[PDB]
Design a protein around this nucleic acid. Structure first.
Ligand SMILES: Cc1cn([C@H]2C[C@H](O)[C@@H](COP(=O)(O)OP(=O)(O)OP(=O)(O)O)O2)c(=O)[nH]c1=O
Ligand SMILES: [Mg+2]
Ligand SMILES: [Mg+2]
Ligand SMILES: [Zn+2]
Lengths: 645, 222, 196
DNA sequence: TTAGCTGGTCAT
RNA sequence: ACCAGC
């Protein structure tokens, strides 16, 4: 087992040059350094450690460090160099599962950290937390250039090689080793009956938990689909921007003549301030002085103003009754512009040269194992029920990638699971009601018949209501889903509690397992805990944040892991079936939002093979962990991500 | 840039106040922000207020971020426009009123631009001739896509535009909007737009503002 | 503009050049120094006569402006006083190209630099025709541009008879070949080159 | 006594 | 505080 650290010139998007690298070993205890001219020796050392059957320990190695080596070894000296995924291990993917909660324990330490490093899994932040940090390269280089007198141009100091780069690279591999010893000094994940610094890649993976293996496979695959990208159409979103940027410049012209200006107190100094519809103070003032009473006081002196009270508002003047609808449309157009094209993290500021969008996906960002999506967030684009939704999802297509050998577009397949957390509930409470609830879910659709039984208008409203009731609501927040009062908000709770009297028994079981005493304060709550964590489906200590969200962190943390194993198995069957992953093969993953997957493939028969084998992968997931239910999915085929929603 | 949320020490929320990398905070509940003449017209000297241009149609934040402030010296109504340099310094001004009394104060350089102290990299730039047309395009695009304008009118398009060559070389596409064109700007990188009215403000005050925004993104080649 | 800048009225310090790649002992041997006048840090080169008597500085700021501190002659080469014999010199073009070859050869072979550049090299080569009759070869190390090749072709006219040999570089000039790790090429191009 | 898990926005 | 998402 060796611990190796790299340093190159730029990010993985545009890297062309190698600068330095340090290797430490656990059998000779040697800081074997390398120079810019020793890159062949560096690759030979790593290939020797692979060929003898060992493990290479990087940090942030799955995302940046290993494909940087595969790119540099090709485009600098013309040699193929691939590390097998069962040899490279990471110490950031381990930190994101062992220390999954830094924001709730990092206070009391902020005296150590500067303040910008609050809750960071970066390698310098663990240098500050382990009390082993000797300087920083960027600060010392900027101070040294201010000491000579030449300017500090662009914050780019990995242009030229020097010796401070090698020195802080040695300190970098020191911090990586001192992190690895603490991360392997854990007992719930690594049993203390064997030393993990001399075992092979058949002992290290399969003589420990399964959560240490599934997380590394997920990090590998999600880094690969991050390197693939999402094909994107630019002209069809510039047409949208030029369309609805000539609408909010009419909804202000038509509206400031209705709602006039006023003097505001800045001898009494006044200012001629005009009506800004994006503010929620000007609309509040102009609706108070036009004959409207809110009768809803969230704030102690101010009303609440949103889309659900701008519908139930009536005034005397029949011009303002029409003007309120234009105010709501103006707020919608403003949010769509700021998301699509004018924000700091807009779509048109993260399009690469080849016409694709690369978004970072953190595989473990939530406390319940749910992935987070960032830079840009490709999980919260507007759906097909919101206005201007189909015109925003029709740009994010897979038919915008014309093939490089035949000049033809591709096909997209999208696969969604059905009734996921609601069927995990029927798994968990099947030991109470003897499994006469997990038979009606398999007998026809659940949400449609729930809509029939609860007389809701839409299936989406029934689907919102059932989880709103299930994850511990109040008296009013499920009466608000239908708009009625707390009388209906009580009778729906009684109707869907007296059907299956096992949810309260399961909740009492969770309360008797986790909490033991909860003292009551008239403005707070003081609880003596017994077990703050829950064993998940693969032994991971899932952290419980609040004792009324225990059913939440029991259901969704067990619902995310079956999807996380499903997305791995549905390529472990496709590669072993005789296909090739990537753009130069036959299929490519594009995005993984919380439930469904989007894959793009070359022909319709390959689409049919993928949409067949997704079912077999999901059924193998359902058999591997012995669920008491029967899992099932549903797939669609199309050109873009508006039919394949 | 954004880092995380801190508890608001003034209005008393939990996840309301946002902390940024520059050291300032911002609350989304209480909306509290924390942390010639040869005489440059000082802003406190001239009773400066960032009012709006209602008869033409321009908001207040455009005049704040572009530096176009109304002066109230001598009991009259001046519209002082500041020109700047790359460091972020006031260099010269233009004082204008109803009688076009163009008082050019300060060291007026030969190649000054209006709104070049904001922008260094990007794909597009929209070059106009005046100041009200430049403010009109910043009104439509909401002050985030780069628009500069000439500091000497439409008679120095071979002098003010020429001495700025390494500045306009920084961008990938240069779009002109003069009066419905220059070639000292680099080759294959000059687009010239065609409008149905006299300038951009006449398209803005008649509802043809779509045909402003349609010519910024689909302009023809020179 | 004022005088020869004394170090005591300029807070003189000899250090390295981290962005360029030259140690402190090379800059101590030559005379390239760093001063703090008017707050902004100024780098400054230090010329002498053939004897060693100080007559001129040359000051560059944080964005490479020119500030001459007096009568800037034409018989003044950067580091002319350091060498009065030998068998080879490497005439560079700038002033860090002199320091780079003193770094990469450890102050052994003589290297001098010109104080004007490719604008008036002939002016300071023909007026320096009397300094070069105490050496044996001349290896011209100029820029690899149109101006560099033009300067070496026009400056191979007023140098002494037939001894001029011209070294070629794959970079712009010598310091970028130092920074990109090409220390194997410029150790060969000094020793052998392609003649006129 | 509380539906939940995320991102993104801003003003001198 | 608002909006969007599974
Ligand atoms: C709408 C909603 C879903 N979820 C969870 C539970 C869902 O099973 C999971 C996926 O959301 P959905 O896919 O929208 O719901 P579903 O899969 O059960 O129904 P179907 O696929 O047949 O249309 O997200 C919440 O936690 N809160 C919510 O408000
Ligand atoms: Mg690293
Ligand atoms: Mg689903
Ligand atoms: Zn506040």
């Amino acid at each position: 087992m060796i611990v190796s650290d790299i340093e190159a010139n730029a990010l993985l998007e545009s890297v062309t040059k190698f600068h330095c690298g340090v290797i430490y070993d656990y059998s000779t205890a040697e800081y074997v350094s390398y120079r810019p001219s020793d890159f062949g020796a560096y690759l030979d050392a790593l290939e020797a450690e692979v060929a003898r059957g060992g493990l290479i320990v990087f940090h942030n190695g799955h995302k940046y460090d290993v494909p940087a080596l595969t790119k540099l070894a090709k485009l600098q000296l013309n040699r193929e160099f691939h590390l097998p995924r069962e040899n490279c291990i990471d110490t950031l993917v381990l930190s994101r599962l062992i220390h999954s909660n830094l924001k709730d324990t990092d206070m009391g330490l902020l005296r150590k950290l500067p303040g910008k490093r609050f809750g960071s899994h970066a390698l310098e932040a663990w240098g500050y937390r382990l009390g082993e940090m000797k300087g920083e390269y960027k600060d010392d280089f900027k101070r040294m250039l201010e000491e000579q007198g030449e300017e500090y141009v662009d914050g780019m100091e990995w242009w030229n090689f020097n010796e401070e780069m090698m020195d802080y690279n040695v300190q970098d591999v020191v911090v990586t080793k001192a992190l690895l010893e603490k991360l392997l000094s854990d007992k719930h994940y690594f049993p203390p009956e064997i030393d993990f610094t001399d075992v092979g890649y058949t002992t290290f993976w399969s003589e420990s938990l399964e959560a240490v293996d599934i997380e590394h496979r997920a990090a590998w695959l999600l880094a690969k689909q991050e390197r693939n990208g999402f094909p994107f159409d630019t002209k069809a979103i510039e047409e949208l921007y030029v369309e609805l940027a000539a609408r909010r410049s009419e909804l202000l012209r038509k509206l400031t003549e209705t709602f006039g200006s006023w003097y505001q107190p800045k001898y009494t100094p006044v200012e001629h301030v005009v009506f800004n519809p994006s503010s929620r103070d000007h609309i509040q003032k102009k609706l108070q002085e036009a004959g409207w009473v809110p009768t809803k006081y969230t704030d102690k002196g101010a009303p609440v103003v949103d889309d659900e009270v701008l519908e139930g508002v009536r005034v005397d003047d029949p011009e303002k009754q029409a003007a309120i609808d234009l105010i709501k449309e103006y707020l919608m157009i403003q949010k769509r512009i700021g998301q699509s094209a004018e924000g700091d993290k807009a779509w048109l500021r993260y399009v690469a040269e080849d016409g694709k969008i690369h978004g970072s996906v953190n595989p473990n960002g939530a406390v319940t194992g749910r992935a987070t999506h960032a830079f840009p967030n490709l999980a919260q684009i507007p759906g097909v029920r919101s206005p201007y939704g189909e015109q925003c999802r029709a740009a994010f297509g897979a038919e915008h990638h014309l093939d490089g050998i035949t000049g033809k577009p591709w096909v997209q397949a999208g696969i969604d699971a059905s009734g996921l957390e609601l069927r995990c509930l029927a798994h968990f409470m099947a030991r109470f009601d003897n499994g006469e609830y997990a038979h009606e879910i398999l007998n026809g659709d659940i949400h449609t018949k729930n809509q029939i039984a609860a007389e809701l208008p839409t299936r989406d409203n029934a689907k919102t209501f059932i989880y709103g009731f299930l994850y511990g609501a109040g008296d009013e927040k499920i009466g608000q889903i239908v708009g009625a009062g707390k009388e209906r908000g009580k009778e729906l709770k009684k109707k869907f509690l007296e059907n299956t009297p096992a949810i309260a028994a399961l909740r009492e079981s969770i309360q008797q397992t986790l909490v033991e005493s909860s003292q009551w304060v008239a403005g707070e709550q003081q609880v003596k805990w017994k077990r703050r964590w829950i064993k998940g489906l693969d032994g991971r200590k899932v952290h419980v944040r609040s004792p009324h969200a225990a059913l939440n962190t029991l259901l969704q943390s067990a619902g995310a892991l079956i999807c996380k194993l499903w997305i791995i198995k549905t390529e472990e069957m496709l590669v072993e079936k005789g296909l090739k992953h990537g753009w130069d093969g036959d299929f490519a993953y594009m995005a993984w939002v919380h439930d469904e997957i989007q894959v793009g493939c070359r022909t319709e028969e390959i689409a049919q093979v993928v949409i067949e084998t997704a079912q077999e992968a999901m059924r193998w997931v359902g058999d591997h962990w012995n669920f008491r239910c029967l899992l099932d999915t549903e797939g669609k085929m199309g050109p873009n991500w508006a039919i394949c929603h | 840039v954004f880092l995380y949320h801190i508890p608001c020490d003034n209005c008393g929320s939990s996840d309301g106040n946002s902390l940024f990398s520059d050291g300032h905070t911002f609350c989304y509940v209480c909306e509290k922000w924390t942390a010639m003449t040869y005489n440059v017209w000082n802003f406190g000297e001239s009773n400066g207020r960032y009012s709006a241009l209602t008869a033409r149609g321009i908001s207040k934040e455009t005049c704040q971020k572009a530096g176009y402030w109304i002066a109230k010296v001598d009991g009259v109504m001046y519209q002082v426009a500041d020109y700047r340099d790359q460091n972020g310094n006031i260099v010269s001004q233009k004082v204008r009123d109803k009688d076009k009394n163009f008082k050019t104060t300060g060291s007026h350089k030969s190649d000054a631009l209006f709104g070049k102290h904001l922008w260094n990299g990007g794909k597009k730039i929209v070059v106009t001739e005046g100041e009200i047309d430049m403010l009109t395009v910043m009104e439509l695009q909401d002050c985030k896509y780069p628009v500069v304008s000439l500091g000497h009118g439409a008679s120095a398009a071979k002098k003010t535009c020429a001495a700025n060559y390494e500045y306009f070389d920084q961008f990938e596409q240069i779009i002109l909007m003069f009066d419905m064109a220059a070639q000292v700007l680099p080759a294959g990188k000059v687009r010239v737009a065609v409008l149905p009215c006299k300038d951009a403000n006449e398209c803005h005050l008649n509802g043809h503002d779509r045909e402003i925004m349609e010519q910024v993104w689909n302009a023809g080649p020179w």
